Design a protein around this ligand. Sequence first.
Ligand SMILES: CCC1=C(C)/C(=C/C2=NC(=C\c3[nH]c(/C=C4\NC(=O)[C@H](C)[C@H]4CC)c(C)c3CCC(=O)O)/C(CCC(=O)O)=C2C)NC1=O
Ligand SMILES: CCC1=C(C)/C(=C/C2=NC(=C\c3[nH]c(/C=C4\NC(=O)[C@H](C)[C@H]4CC)c(C)c3CCC(=O)O)/C(CCC(=O)O)=C2C)NC1=O
Ligand SMILES: CCC1=C(C)/C(=C/C2=NC(=C\c3[nH]c(/C=C4\NC(=O)[C@H](C)[C@H]4CC)c(C)c3CCC(=O)O)/C(CCC(=O)O)=C2C)NC1=O
Ligand SMILES: CCC1=C(C)/C(=C/C2=NC(=C\c3[nH]c(/C=C4\NC(=O)[C@H](C)[C@H]4CC)c(C)c3CCC(=O)O)/C(CCC(=O)O)=C2C)NC1=O
Ligand SMILES: CCC1=C(C)/C(=C/C2=NC(=C\c3[nH]c(/C=C4\NC(=O)[C@H](C)[C@H]4CC)c(C)c3CCC(=O)O)/C(CCC(=O)O)=C2C)NC1=O
Ligand SMILES: CCC1=C(C)/C(=C/C2=NC(=C\c3[nH]c(/C=C4\NC(=O)[C@H](C)[C@H]4CC)c(C)c3CCC(=O)O)/C(CCC(=O)O)=C2C)NC1=O
Ligand SMILES: CCC1=C(C)/C(=C/C2=NC(=C\c3[nH]c(/C=C4\NC(=O)[C@H](C)[C@H]4CC)c(C)c3CCC(=O)O)/C(CCC(=O)O)=C2C)NC1=O
Ligand SMILES: CCC1=C(C)/C(=C/C2=NC(=C\c3[nH]c(/C=C4\NC(=O)[C@H](C)[C@H]4CC)c(C)c3CCC(=O)O)/C(CCC(=O)O)=C2C)NC1=O
Ligand SMILES: CCC1=C(C)/C(=C/C2=NC(=C\c3[nH]c(/C=C4\NC(=O)[C@H](C)[C@H]4CC)c(C)c3CCC(=O)O)/C(CCC(=O)O)=C2C)NC1=O
Lengths: 160, 160, 160, 160, 66, 149, 162, 162, 162, 162
Amino acid sequence: SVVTKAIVSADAEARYLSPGELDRIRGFVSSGERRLRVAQTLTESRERIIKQAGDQLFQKRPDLVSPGGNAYGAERTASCLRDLDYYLRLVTFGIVAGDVTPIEEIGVIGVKEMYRNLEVPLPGMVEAVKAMKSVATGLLSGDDSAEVGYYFDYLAGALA
Amino acid sequence: SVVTKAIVSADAEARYLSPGELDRIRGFVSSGERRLRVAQTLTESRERIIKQAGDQLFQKRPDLVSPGGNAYGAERTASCLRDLDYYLRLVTFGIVAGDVTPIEEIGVIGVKEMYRNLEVPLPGMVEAVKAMKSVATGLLSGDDSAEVGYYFDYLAGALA
Amino acid sequence: SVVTKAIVSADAEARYLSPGELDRIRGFVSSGERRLRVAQTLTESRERIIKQAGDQLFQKRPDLVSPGGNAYGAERTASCLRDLDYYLRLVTFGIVAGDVTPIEEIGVIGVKEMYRNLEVPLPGMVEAVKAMKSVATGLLSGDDSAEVGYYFDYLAGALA
Amino acid sequence: SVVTKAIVSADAEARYLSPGELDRIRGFVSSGERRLRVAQTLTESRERIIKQAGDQLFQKRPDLVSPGGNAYGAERTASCLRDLDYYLRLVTFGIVAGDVTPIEEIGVIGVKEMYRNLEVPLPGMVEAVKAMKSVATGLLSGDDSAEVGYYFDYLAGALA
Amino acid sequence: TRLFKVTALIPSYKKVRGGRELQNTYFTKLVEYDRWFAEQQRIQKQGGKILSVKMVAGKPGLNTGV
Amino acid sequence: LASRTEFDALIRAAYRQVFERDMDSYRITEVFSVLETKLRNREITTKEFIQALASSDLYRKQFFEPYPPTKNVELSLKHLLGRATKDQAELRKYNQIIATQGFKPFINAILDSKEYGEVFGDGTVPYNRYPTLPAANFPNTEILYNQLT
Amino acid sequence: MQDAITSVINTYDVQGKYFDTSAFDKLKAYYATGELRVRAAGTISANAATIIKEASAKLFSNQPDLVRPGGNAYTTRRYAACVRDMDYFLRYATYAMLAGDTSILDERVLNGLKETYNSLGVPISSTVQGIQAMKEVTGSLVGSGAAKEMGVYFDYLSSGLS
Amino acid sequence: MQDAITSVINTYDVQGKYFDTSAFDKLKAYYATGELRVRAAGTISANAATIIKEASAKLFSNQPDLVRPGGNAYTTRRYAACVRDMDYFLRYATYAMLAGDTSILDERVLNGLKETYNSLGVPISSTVQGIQAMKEVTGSLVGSGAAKEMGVYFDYLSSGLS
Amino acid sequence: MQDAITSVINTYDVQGKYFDTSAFDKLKAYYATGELRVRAAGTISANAATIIKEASAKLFSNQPDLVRPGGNAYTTRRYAACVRDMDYFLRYATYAMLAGDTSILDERVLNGLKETYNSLGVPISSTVQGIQAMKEVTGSLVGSGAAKEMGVYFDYLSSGLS
Amino acid sequence: MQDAITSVINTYDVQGKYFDTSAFDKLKAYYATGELRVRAAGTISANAATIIKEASAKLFSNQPDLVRPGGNAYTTRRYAACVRDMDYFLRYATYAMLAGDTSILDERVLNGLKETYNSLGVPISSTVQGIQAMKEVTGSLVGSGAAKEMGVYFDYLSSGLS
Ligand SMILES: CCC1=C(C)/C(=C/C2=NC(=C\c3[nH]c(/C=C4\NC(=O)[C@H](C)[C@H]4CC)c(C)c3CCC(=O)O)/C(CCC(=O)O)=C2C)NC1=O
Ligand SMILES: CCC1=C(C)/C(=C/C2=NC(=C\c3[nH]c(/C=C4\NC(=O)[C@H](C)[C@H]4CC)c(C)c3CCC(=O)O)/C(CCC(=O)O)=C2C)NC1=O
Ligand SMILES: CCC1=C(C)/C(=C/C2=NC(=C\c3[nH]c(/C=C4\NC(=O)[C@H](C)[C@H]4CC)c(C)c3CCC(=O)O)/C(CCC(=O)O)=C2C)NC1=O
Ligand SMILES: CCC1=C(C)/C(=C/C2=NC(=C\c3[nH]c(/C=C4\NC(=O)[C@H](C)[C@H]4CC)c(C)c3CCC(=O)O)/C(CCC(=O)O)=C2C)NC1=O
Ligand SMILES: CCC1=C(C)/C(=C/C2=NC(=C\c3[nH]c(/C=C4\NC(=O)[C@H](C)[C@H]4CC)c(C)c3CCC(=O)O)/C(CCC(=O)O)=C2C)NC1=O
Ligand SMILES: CCC1=C(C)/C(=C/C2=NC(=C\c3[nH]c(/C=C4\NC(=O)[C@H](C)[C@H]4CC)c(C)c3CCC(=O)O)/C(CCC(=O)O)=C2C)NC1=O
Ligand SMILES: CCC1=C(C)/C(=C/C2=NC(=C\c3[nH]c(/C=C4\NC(=O)[C@H](C)[C@H]4CC)c(C)c3CCC(=O)O)/C(CCC(=O)O)=C2C)NC1=O
Ligand SMILES: CCC1=C(C)/C(=C/C2=NC(=C\c3[nH]c(/C=C4\NC(=O)[C@H](C)[C@H]4CC)c(C)c3CCC(=O)O)/C(CCC(=O)O)=C2C)NC1=O
Ligand SMILES: CCC1=C(C)/C(=C/C2=NC(=C\c3[nH]c(/C=C4\NC(=O)[C@H](C)[C@H]4CC)c(C)c3CCC(=O)O)/C(CCC(=O)O)=C2C)NC1=O
């Protein structure tokens, strides 16, 4: 999290946290309530978000659900929407954490090797994450939408 | 500053700035006018603070102005207040920057061996900066005085 | 000890001691009785050396026992004289050792951090050891005064 | 020499020489004169040393100057005795220096590779140095013989 | 400041090495500013000759940003 | 331009020596892309490549953050000098550096030591040294190097 | 290391569960104590040298044998080592307080510390007493509100040694 | 490296003066543009891969000989080095735009880049055209004001290379 | 490490005492024996290669299987390591005799030696008989008093290994 | 590096001649000065801190612009670098005085110092003034002959930096 990153950066220098790091932690904890409200909003509408994002992704990329596509069939489509659900949960974790760390350790480190082991096209993942970003940012106000879009953009860049 | 520290952090691992780094940059730029008017207030009132802090110093520790003291005499006392003026200017730079980085780079890195080369006792420097902190936070409002206080406490901790 | 230094230097090079180092050991072992005489002479004048050195130090630096000084008061002056007595014992140890090693691992490694934690001024320590030098070399013949002043100068440079 | 080794050892830790190290240098410069007389005696009698050492070597090892040997021939025997002259000069250098450092850094590093390129048998060199030591110690007194034979033994061990 | 570009020769005196070592004899290297005192001290200790060093990255006399 | 494959082999050996294994999942190649570019162009030597890997944030997360300073000293000595912590003096020296200046001065103190210059110089990636001296260096080093990550 | 927020995140990630009401409650609790933790950390940063001064003075006053000849803290080197250990303890307890989690304590301080002290002959009881002295001084400086929280991490460290 | 704030601090510290009215004006000018820079940087980071995609496509369409045999970008290795160089230019132009200052550009991109490219045989004019393609794509992406901001640093890179 | 002089110094430093008549007596005893110690060290150093010659010859005569194929001293490399270890023991025993104390033995030879050899299948008993072979050879060269002196440190190594 | 004895050894080795009368006279001359050099080295070691103290005070008194804003020695960092350089100059001149030869100054001081200062923009004339200041300060403490001997190496350093 923000606090953890400040602590490790201070410990790397064998010092106490600087005035800037303390201001960073104060800003993070002061805005914790709106972060929790955003995470609650995303959690409440996770099913709607996943269905709409899956529809958008399969409309923009019909080849995935066509025969020979990596997501062809009921079980593969279920696995696809399951991965989208995984990443939505990770984005909520990132919102509450204030940084993309939990996203990174849970679903970014090793992701290329995993989806390579799964014949999963990374451009498909990028398109799916962009679709889920648009659907999610639709359900939030602009000030919160920009913040959540930054986590989604980090996820898309990591999959790119 | 905040921007330089975030950029060097992101360049260390060859990436773009993370959402947390962009958030801290936004927090820094949003608070720019407040810290800048704080720098105002500390800047027009340099002389009052310097002389009051010198008075409080000499009152708390009289050995420095006593025989055998480092500030004995008129010229050494003038240089003593000159050093206080230096450090108040460094505090203003740190306030505008949002970090203490100018404070290290100009007056903290190497300060130990410099003052040791000058026969200047570091406890006296800590007393000086605490006197300056008290006088300066006297002139500021509570929120502004607090954030100026953190920079002054950092200066005191780095000095000794 | 001289023998210890010779053995350590030989061990760093993974060799036996050269005839030069063996000659050095023979010289030290031949000077041992004179070293013991000097150590006994200093040890017998323990209290006189400490008292006179404290007197000269406090007259040369009145601010140390002046209010606001680290040695202000009876018990802090007693601790000051105890520190001087420690270093006198260390100097006798160094005399019998034929080098400044025991002085170093007992009283020079970490003395900076120790006296910083004790807010004891290091310069005042330097005038204290110089006063000890004067007093102790005053009771010895010029030849023995030379080696004793050598150890006192090592101590003064190590504290400075 | 010993002074150079001490200076390098101190520069390793970036410090001035210890009182014991200065005492070591004092002992070295005290023995310098006797070392100078010993090297004077060796350099005066270099011709007889070379003649006797070469004769003793060739009688002990006739195959060197016998047909098929490396030292057979007038010019090759001259080269052999010239090598003996080099090593005697190096021994004198080492004696004045008080250490085997000049001996090694002119005639020990790469000596095996050089004599391998020259078909020169190493046991022949060892026997030459041994006979040369015998002659040199014969010409010198009892006290000088020990340290003079020290460098010859070092050289023989280097060739062996 | 923050970067020096160092060209130094480091001769060999202790031994003649079986490997080529003409990696390590004559070289030009980029060394960061706070590194250079110790680095130059090292090349001086193994007897090397410093042929040149240049400013490359930063500007001399900067008070911050170093 | 030439001997590209050998040089990439050297780069990956350096990764395996500093981080004890391949770090492809951590996208180590793109993290150190500029560093690899400089080392290809011969602007920097192998020692500075090692210094940049051992002072990296990835190295700090792998081997500095998870462990106490004593284990930090012995791990970084294994990775950068090829041996376990040698004696009490070395432990004191690196403990004091870690306590007062932190992680990066500790790494540079290891890498700027005379021992690294004598053993590895500026061109060879560090390796297990199987040290015969001093006492207990060999078994401690073997215990460290017989351990998987 | 791990803090309270990352602890909740890990707990819910292992279950593969989105955040429920209890998770949000714990997150609100940490966000509510955050400003107090930040003030305490800033105060300790300001007065760390004084804290170590007074804590060491108190410990060596209660146990004068430690700094007199024959004590484990008698020499300049061992006195500096003692003060360095106490500086460790203060800084890492401050980190653990700012994190709201004792994980950093286990993974940077306590692992192997007993073995190190037993190898060196360092008295464990006196180190624990020094940690109590740091606890008292720090609690006095940070105030009643943060003293209870800070004592939790100091007590964790003391129980880890003892 | 220097941002705008550090540049002002350095000027007024080399002159040993407190901030006058002009320095405060420059600081306000930087702070006012901060949110614009943050939004543009986030947009560029979101679309960095796409920007490099299209910029390399335009570069190799206008100059197809670069990737055909005999071109400097003809190999998987050399094409990879070309697109990686473009990645470097985009990332550091983003750094420079966010700092508001060009010291990072010449400090960590441009020192020896002309010499290195001349030694390698990299065509300077082709790299300049690629940077201009990056400029056009990024400008059409971010927005007019952010387009001008990024154009300043892209032009700095182009002028430094040529 | 530690020698006799440093041993007296440390004993009186742990007590916080200036030197007494007993301390001066011990120091005079060491200074009395210094010349004999130097002579023994010099004659050992001059003849170290010979001592190793004979000691290894006796050990491999009494225990042929060590140098027969499959023995722990069967290869040029392992035989070289064997004689190198014997030279190590001789050099450090000379160091200890010159110092007048066995602390260097524990610190720089015996520490980890038993488990070093056990992790290598080096026969510890055979190493002990090699050490007695060195003892017997050295005693005949150094003379009776220096023989009894060197025997103390050789037996110290033998007992620490056993 | 090389000392006076090693310098004679090299000058006779490169010409391949045995030590003649002149070489022995030079060696006797060096041995005669040994006690004086050792006393001077001990005195400088005792007072090195003070020499740097008051020499830097004189240098910055004669050139106050060096330590005022805009000067090369204006910061705690750059003042620290300046006094570190003066301390290294004093210690290395002391080494050279002990050795009796200026080879250590060439190998370990002047080796790259001129052009390192040129790159850093360090003012050479002020460095020369600082070296001269250390020269008078050391002379006052070491007396006549030792002051002449130190002045030789100080002037060598001044010429090398110039
Ligand atoms: C911007 C960074 C910076 C700093 C801080 C700085 C300090 C500084 N103070 C100096 C002198 C001095 N400074 C002092 C101040 C001391 N008097 C009392 O003891 C106090 C404890 C203490 C001040 C609060 C005194 C007394 C002198 C005169 C020393 C002498 O002449 O012996 C000097 C030597 C040149 C001069 O006389 O002006 C410097 C360089 N220089 C820098 O470039
Ligand atoms: C054997 C190595 C060794 C040394 C040297 C040593 C010094 C030492 N001096 C101390 C106190 C002290 N030491 C001094 C002496 C200083 N005050 C004056 O200004 C002088 C400049 C200077 C002496 C010449 C004073 C005044 C105190 C009392 C400090 C206090 O009560 O807070 C203490 C704190 C514990 C105690 O008083 O028992 C130590 C450990 N300890 C060691 O184990
Ligand atoms: C100062 C350091 C130094 C040394 C030591 C040295 C040795 C040396 N001896 C040489 C020739 C020689 N040296 C010898 C000597 C050997 N013959 C017998 O076997 C003896 C065992 C042994 C001498 C004791 C001989 C026979 C040659 C002639 C080789 C030939 O021409 O084929 C040569 C070839 C160059 C020449 O002949 O002028 C060198 C370089 N050079 C140096 O710069
Ligand atoms: C792998 C490709 C490669 C080569 C070939 C090479 C040559 C080379 N020879 C060297 C040493 C040397 N080489 C020579 C030989 C020369 N002087 C004599 O007059 C001869 C005429 C001539 C040989 C034919 C000498 C005398 C030295 C020692 C120089 C010194 O350090 O004083 C050195 C300095 C490094 C060292 O001392 O080991 C190099 C770099 N370097 C390389 O990286
Ligand atoms: C961050 C986790 C961590 C800690 C805390 C840590 C402590 C630590 N303490 C040490 C020594 C020491 N520690 C102490 C402190 C104790 N003895 C005094 O009497 C006190 C009662 C008490 C302190 C309150 C002393 C005296 C030594 C020196 C022991 C010796 O050298 O013999 C050492 C050996 C290295 C050295 O001496 O510099 C370590 C590694 N190591 C770690 O990795
Ligand atoms: C000699 C080493 C070398 C190689 C191999 C190489 C490959 C290469 N293929 C390219 C385009 C392409 N390559 C392909 C081929 C793919 N399309 C389908 O997915 C298939 C799976 C697959 C073919 C089997 C396509 C379709 C393009 C056009 C891309 C575009 O126009 O957007 C390009 C971009 C410029 C161009 O069109 O020439 C390169 C550089 N370049 C080299 O210097
Ligand atoms: C972050 C700062 C930085 C930059 C900018 C940088 C550029 C850079 N590009 C290089 C290679 C290269 N760069 C290019 C790209 C060029 N050739 C194509 O034709 C294009 C026209 C053009 C790109 C738009 C190519 C093809 C190479 C390979 C050269 C070769 O191996 O022959 C190299 C040599 C080392 C290597 O091959 O990895 C450097 C140093 N390095 C840095 O550390
Ligand atoms: C498989 C690798 C290996 C080798 C090669 C090896 C050699 C070896 N030769 C030995 C003895 C010996 N070796 C020789 C051979 C020499 N006599 C003449 O001078 C010749 C120049 C030369 C042989 C052509 C002799 C005569 C001895 C008896 C030495 C003695 O008893 O004093 C010994 C001592 C133990 C024993 O006698 O059984 C070893 C270890 N050991 C190994 O583990
Ligand atoms: C072991 C021999 C040796 C020496 C002495 C040496 C000097 C040296 N001085 C340096 C910087 C410096 N040196 C000085 C000193 C100058 N400024 C003042 O005006 C004075 C006139 C003058 C000194 C009397 C200053 C101020 C700097 C910092 C310059 C900067 O960073 O802008 C640096 C750059 C690295 C660093 O700052 O840590 C070196 C290497 N290098 C060596 O290898």
